[PDB]
Amino acid sequence: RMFKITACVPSQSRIRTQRELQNTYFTKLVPYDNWFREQQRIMKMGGKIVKVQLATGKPGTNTGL
Amino acid sequence: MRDAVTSLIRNYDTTGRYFDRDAIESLKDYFASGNDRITVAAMINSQSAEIVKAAANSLFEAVPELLLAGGNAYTTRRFSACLRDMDYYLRYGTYALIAGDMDVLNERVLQGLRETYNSLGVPIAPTVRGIQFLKDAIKEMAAAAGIANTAFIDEPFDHMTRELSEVDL
Amino acid sequence: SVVSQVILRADDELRYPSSGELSGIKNFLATGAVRIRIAEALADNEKKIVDQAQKQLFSIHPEYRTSGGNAATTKQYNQCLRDYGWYLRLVTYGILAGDKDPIERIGLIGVKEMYNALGVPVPGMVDAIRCLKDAALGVLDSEEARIAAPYFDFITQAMS
Amino acid sequence: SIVTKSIVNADAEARYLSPGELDRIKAFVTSGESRLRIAETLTGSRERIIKSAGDALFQKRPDVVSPGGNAYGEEMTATCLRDMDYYLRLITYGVVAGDVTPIEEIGLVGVREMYKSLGTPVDAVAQAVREMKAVATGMMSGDDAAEAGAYFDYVIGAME
Amino acid sequence: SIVTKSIVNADAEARYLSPGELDRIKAFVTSGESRLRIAETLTGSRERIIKSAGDALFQKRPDVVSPGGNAYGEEMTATCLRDMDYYLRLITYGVVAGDVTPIEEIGLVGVREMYKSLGTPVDAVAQAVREMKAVATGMMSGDDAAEAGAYFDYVIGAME
Amino acid sequence: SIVTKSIVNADAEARYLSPGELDRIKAFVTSGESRLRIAETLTGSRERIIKSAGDALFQKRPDVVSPGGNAYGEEMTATCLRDMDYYLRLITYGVVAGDVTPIEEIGLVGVREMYKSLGTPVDAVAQAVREMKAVATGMMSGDDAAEAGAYFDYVIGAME
Amino acid sequence: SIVTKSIVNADAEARYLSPGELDRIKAFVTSGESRLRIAETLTGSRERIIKSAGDALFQKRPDVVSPGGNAYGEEMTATCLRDMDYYLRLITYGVVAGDVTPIEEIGLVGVREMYKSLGTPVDAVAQAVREMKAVATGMMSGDDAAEAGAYFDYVIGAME
Amino acid sequence: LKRLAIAQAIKLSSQLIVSRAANRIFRPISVSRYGPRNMTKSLRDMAWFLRYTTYAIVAGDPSILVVNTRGLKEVIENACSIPATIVAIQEMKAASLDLFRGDREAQETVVQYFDVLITEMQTQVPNDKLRQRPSIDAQGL
Amino acid sequence: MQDAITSVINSADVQGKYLDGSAMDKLKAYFTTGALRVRAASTISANAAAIVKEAVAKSLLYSDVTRPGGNMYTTRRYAACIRDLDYYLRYATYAMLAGDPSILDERVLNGLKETYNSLGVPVGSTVQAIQAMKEVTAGLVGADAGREMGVYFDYICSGLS
Amino acid sequence: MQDAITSVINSADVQGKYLDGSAMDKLKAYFTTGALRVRAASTISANAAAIVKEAVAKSLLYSDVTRPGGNMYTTRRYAACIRDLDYYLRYATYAMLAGDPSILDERVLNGLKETYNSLGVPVGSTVQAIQAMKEVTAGLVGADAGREMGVYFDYICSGLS
Amino acid sequence: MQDAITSVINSADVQGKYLDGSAMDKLKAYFTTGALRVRAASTISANAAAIVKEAVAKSLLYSDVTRPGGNMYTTRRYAACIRDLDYYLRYATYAMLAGDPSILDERVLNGLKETYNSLGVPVGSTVQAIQAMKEVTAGLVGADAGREMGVYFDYICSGLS
Numbered sequence A: 001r002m003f004k005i006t007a008c009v010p011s012q013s014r015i016r017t018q019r020e021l022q023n024t025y026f027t028k029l030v031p032y033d034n035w036f037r038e039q040q041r042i043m044k045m046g047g048k049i050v051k052v053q054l055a056t057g058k059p060g061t062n063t064g065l
Numbered sequence B: 001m002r003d004a005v006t007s008l009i010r011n012y013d014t015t016g017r018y019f020d021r022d023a024i025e026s027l028k029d030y031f032a033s034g035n036d037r038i039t040v041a042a043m044i045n046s047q048s049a050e051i052v053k054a055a056a057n058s059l060f061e062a063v064p065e066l067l068l069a070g071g072n073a074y075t076t077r078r079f080s081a082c083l084r085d086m087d088y089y090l091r092y093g094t095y096a097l098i099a100g101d102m103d104v105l106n107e108r109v110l111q112g113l114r115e116t117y118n119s120l121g122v123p124i125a126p127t128v129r130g131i132q133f134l135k136d137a138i139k140e141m142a143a144a145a146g147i148a149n150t151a152f153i154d155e156p157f158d159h160m161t162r163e164l165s166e167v168d169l
Numbered sequence C: 001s002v003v004s005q006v007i008l009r010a011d012d013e014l015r016y017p018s019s020g021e022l023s024g025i026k027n028f029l030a031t032g033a034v035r036i037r038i039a040e041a042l043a044d045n046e047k048k049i050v051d052q053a054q055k056q057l058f059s060i061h062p063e064y065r066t067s068g069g070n071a072a073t074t075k076q077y078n079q080c081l082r083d084y085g086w087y088l089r090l091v092t093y094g095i096l097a098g099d100k101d102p103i104e105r106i107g108l109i110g111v112k113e114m115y116n117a118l119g120v121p122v123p124g125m126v127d128a129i130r131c132l133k134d135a136a137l138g139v140l141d142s143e144e145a146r147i148a149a150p151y152f153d154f155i156t157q158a159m160s
Numbered sequence D, E, F, G: 001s002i003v004t005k006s007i008v009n010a011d012a013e014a015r016y017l018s019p020g021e022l023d024r025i026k027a028f029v030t031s032g033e034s035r036l037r038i039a040e041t042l043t044g045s046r047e048r049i050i051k052s053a054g055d056a057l058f059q060k061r062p063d064v065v066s067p068g069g070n071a072y073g074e075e076m077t078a079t080c081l082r083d084m085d086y087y088l089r090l091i092t093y094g095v096v097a098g099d100v101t102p103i104e105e106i107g108l109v110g111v112r113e114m115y116k117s118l119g120t121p122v123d124a125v126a127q128a129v130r131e132m133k134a135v136a137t138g139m140m141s142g143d144d145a146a147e148a149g150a151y152f153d154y155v156i157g158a159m160e
Numbered sequence H: 001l002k003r004l005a006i007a008q009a010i011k012l013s014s015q016l017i018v019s020r021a022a023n024r025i026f027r028p029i030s031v032s033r034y035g036p037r038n039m040t041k042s043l044r045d046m047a048w049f050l051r052y053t054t055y056a057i058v059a060g061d062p063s064i065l066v067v068n069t070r071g072l073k074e075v076i077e078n079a080c081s082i083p084a085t086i087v088a089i090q091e092m093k094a095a096s097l098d099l100f101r102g103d104r105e106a107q108e109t110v111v112q113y114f115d116v117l118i119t120e121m122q123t124q125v126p127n128d129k130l131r132q133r134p135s136i137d138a139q140g141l
Numbered sequence I, J, K: 001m002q003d004a005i006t007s008v009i010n011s012a013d014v015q016g017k018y019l020d021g022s023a024m025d026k027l028k029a030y031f032t033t034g035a036l037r038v039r040a041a042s043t044i045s046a047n048a049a050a051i052v053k054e055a056v057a058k059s060l061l062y063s064d065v066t067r068p069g070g071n072m073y074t075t076r077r078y079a080a081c082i083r084d085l086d087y088y089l090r091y092a093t094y095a096m097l098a099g100d101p102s103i104l105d106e107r108v109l110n111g112l113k114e115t116y117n118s119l120g121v122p123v124g125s126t127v128q129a130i131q132a133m134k135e136v137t138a139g140l141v142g143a144d145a146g147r148e149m150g151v152y153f154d155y156i157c158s159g160l161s
Ligand SMILES: *[C@H](C)[C@H]1/C(=C/c2[nH]c(/C=C3N=C(/C=C4\NC(=O)C(CC)=C4C)C(C)=C\3CCC(=O)O)c(CCC(=O)O)c2C)NC(=O)[C@@H]1C
Pocket: B066, B071, B072, B073, B074, B077, B078, B079, B081, B082, B083, B085, B086, B088, B108, B109, B113, B116, B120, B122, B123, B125, B126, B127, B130, H141
């Protein structure tokens, strides 16, 4: 199962560390098992989550993921 | 990391005994001199970038080769690296001044400093003389500011240059 | 603030705030009223505080007023005064949160990038904040000066 | 402790101690006398605390001393009172240090794994620390009982 | 199942099914008839399995039915036998599927968190599945008892 | 082999062997006798397999033995039959082990890089293993030819 | 091209173009006239290059035109000369662009997979580009033949 | 070889370039109340700018100039007058173009590297990269 | 993420003004309620698992959602439900300590509706579970601390609905 | 991702019921067809590259798409086309072995239409290529194994269209 | 990412044709303008920070956006604004060197509008800042090099708006 999420994560640490730029506002397929820590981490960095959509899940099943 | 309190706690924990008379007296001895450490730390937090620069110029007046040709504080890249190193020494000296124990200096400064310095070609000797130029500057500045006792100021820089020290005796 | 730092650190390690952190929160929230009083006293007298600090800064450095400096024309000079006023406002903000958090978040993360994007040197700003420090310390008593002073010294630290 | 936690929290952030953290360390340094008084109160009367708390625990949870429970028999009840003595000692350490990093960093990290490997119900251990808290806060003044009950509260919270 | 596990294990490796995995699927396909016979044996006599296993469990662990335990009372004992019925149903699913991914993927992942939130001793649940295994392998032939006891063994192993 | 693959696949997953994997290992353990019979069939008649397969290959692909090809001359044709002997030996290893990890882990990983560095057409090597498969499955019974042709099939598939 | 490669190589490094890369682009900009002359030399005489190179290839490798080979028959030989025309066109593109990223990025990435799916010997294609290189460097002056033979060299090197 | 020719020309005549700088400098002309301690440092730095100009000219990249005289300004701003150093480096550029000539190709290389010097003497300082860490046990640097 | 102090400072800074008397009065209100906030946070940290399991025992147990077909059926779904309720109680404690619900819509209510709608999680049943959690913790910490917990619990239920 | 067995178990579990006679009959049907599925999977694993290259030789070769301007023109595009067809044959083999097309819409047909529409890949030409692949493999493995391959090939073509 | 040469080659390759006279004339035009492109790129690499700070001094300084409430208010926002303007000047230099704006919509204008709309960045003020940057660099490098810089600056402003 996978979530086709779309989020925008500003860093708020690039000014101190002076690193080069990664493009934010990504659209990615997250696996279901670690989508939790990923959503929590996007909330840790302070970024807004635009769209969460279950991609491959067929929701409501008990086995077969 | 350990302050003096967690040092006494780990000391009493490994035998499984409660605090006696003497443990309460040593904890009172840390808690009584706590305010003195905290005004010394605030007075250092006043002039940290000034004290680091003054200790650096006194060290370069002591050993004059490092500004000159073959020295290791040669270019401005090396000069700025040396002044940032002295800022590190003053920062963790302040941390050990507040903690009252040398475990922060052992875990975060002195463990494997000699490896980096011997590898990079950074000398260990004027590093130590600069650490105690910082110590002498801090000591006279805090003795000027009404503080009677300076043994706790004496503690961490003397430890840091007993550890980077080469034992030849 | 203090409670923001306690909440964010407890939010990292996925736990409730412990008893020592909450007791530090209590110790700040008990003496918040003295902080409210000293931020009142700093908001009152700010014109004369910025004024004497400006006078002592251009005692220490007449270089900026004179030809080739940043205080040459009175538009830039008015912004020198306005920078002083904004920094005193940020000092009262840093006092009232009980910590360095809003003053660093609003005015200290990247002062070097801004004042190199402009033309005024940062050691001049170090001397300027120290002038603001002894100016604002002449207007409060010691019971409040011990709370006022080290925020000025933290600005001095993050400048350099 | 408080000083360790402040030093580490400024240490990861690559900054010095903020002045709010510094008056936190200062307030803990001033309150150390009351902390040492609570520690002497908890240390000097440990016999009655452990005895009365074991009595009230086995009154409250009699199945762990009944045949079939963990603490059944002479030496098993002695080991049970020894575990309660360990936790009261860690309570005294956390009272002195001003934070729960002695208690957590010694006797609360793998407490579930250890007491699951021994076959011990952890809720009955939480009841043991609850009865220890009742006897201990029945032994002190009001603010002293609150300050000790904060650490007792942390131990029972870290059980479940 | 076996086919799901082989497909996924070849799927991560970016390869097709190896011939050894293919004769594994073939042998499971041939042994499906005996698997269905074990499933009918477990399905048709579920009443006596649940009844006798509950009787032997409450004989073995009487404290959970005594006042103070979890399964005390009429509806609590009915819910206890219902949980045993759930686990026997998952045993039948794992017998048919040829692997424990039905049992694990339905009723064994957060079993410790659930039974800790309910207040249930998990060792007594392991004893319940042990008595279910005793009654079930007392009901079949030798190789059938071994093949069913493999999945019963997995459930009791995943408890502790 | 099968046991290595099952152990590793349970090993990454931090779990024991599932019962379906265990009856997979059990079925491979029972079929090892037929695997050893196929291995003796392939081992004892290696001379005729290599000879007839080389004959049919050079009949099918005559350009590699014509002047200009790789296997032109006495010693080059001897090295060609030696490479075919190597691949028949790896076929015997994969027949015994029950999986293609001997064949892949010895003589199929960098086969394209090696035969490109030697200047060899890899399609003609696939034809060599095809003729070896024809002679070998012409030498056995039906299910034995299918079980050996699975590994021959894997070698020709791993060529292209 | 050269400008694309320099821009990308400075682009990953988060820096501007170094002055050495800038005089590289400048030297390529000045040598573009000779590059365009080599391109007109290769473009205007493509008929004789493709014809003579196909003649010398089928003289050198007659088995691919013999019955049994890939390019056997009228339309198959026409497709063979068309593939040679494609590669000469990519040679002209790489001559103009000053680098092999047109040649590689159009007709050299999956060339082994494509010619394996078609059933084509890739060594005979390398011989086709070798004969094209012989006819083309027989058609120019010395430094022009070296500069075109660099890209012909890259194509034959990327074949094997 | 042209870069070596202009580097050898600069090395062979560095003394008169530094002497021309000396009576250009000592934006008021400097008072020479500096004393010997500031004066020997000043003479060493007016050498040293030319040294890393010559190293940059031979090396082919001005990075050896950049990574040194970028943060140089606030090291020497408490010391001395910074526009005096600016017109000093500009004058040494004029002394290089005084010294040799070309058909506007080697002069262009020399004014390129000297322009990198005058650009980096105004970049006053960048703040250092802070490795702040999220872990407690880690240290920030 | 901002408490009452940081929001007051942000309002006075977006104004560009100094801290006037209304801001002083707001900060005095927070500095009077802070000790009650601290004691309620300690009491809630005491009984996290008890409040969560009493909320499930009040609302979700013995209903259809723990039966077959429900979204709380399996042990994985039960463990994830206990995890979600522990999250709601923990972040309600954080918003009670800060005195501002900015952490709730920053870090709970951000993509929670779309996550629950993609998974098939019933929003009404989890709103009833959060309401029972609020009722239990308001029985735990008293009237006014229960009210200042229930305002953020109602914030979570309003953003979820 | 679920085979016929896991889907039957999931239906009986979402019911909450035991395995009745209809589920037993469905599993008996799968356990009768499984040996044919195994042998067809081995025969398809034998001739992956041959089936792919015969599908291109039937449909895509000598048409406009391999000429200049076509989307199968360059060697990179040809290699990616062979890769895509190998994916379709491999996942059709997996769905044949499982007896359920859940892997196809989980792992092939998930974002395939939007990927092909963003790249400019012709969907009709690749549907004809998959149909020729189906025709070749149904000529390879026989009538009924070719039919049970073609049901998942038609599933891929229907989800692609 | 393609320059004028790679785009000409891509057009002639998508045709499948050889390089005819129009492609030769386009490449001759690029090979005549390339030395001017090189010298303008060196002159722009000379004065990156000066062009950026003169663009802020022309447009964004002493307006409302550097005052409280503006999006360029804090030092973090000022540093990020200088970073964004340095990005625009650097990529305009790259597109000037390539002679093709494909890098601009590949690597600047890709998600820039949605990023700026999510952050709250004013697009008109940054368009005016890029226009002042264009005016300053066209004063720096001359008429025609300033024009061939301003075509890509106008490309960035058009894709941003
Ligand atoms: C200055 C007075 C002396 C001096 C210093 C010098 N140091 C370096 C390089 C490094 N120094 C360190 C030091 C530390 N890292 C730590 O984490 C701590 C504890 C907090 C210390 C003390 C490290 C890691 C480096 C490597 C650079 C890096 O940080 O990545 C240099 C540069 C050496 C060079 O030539 O590159 C210099 C000049 N040298 C002296 O002469 C003085 C005695």
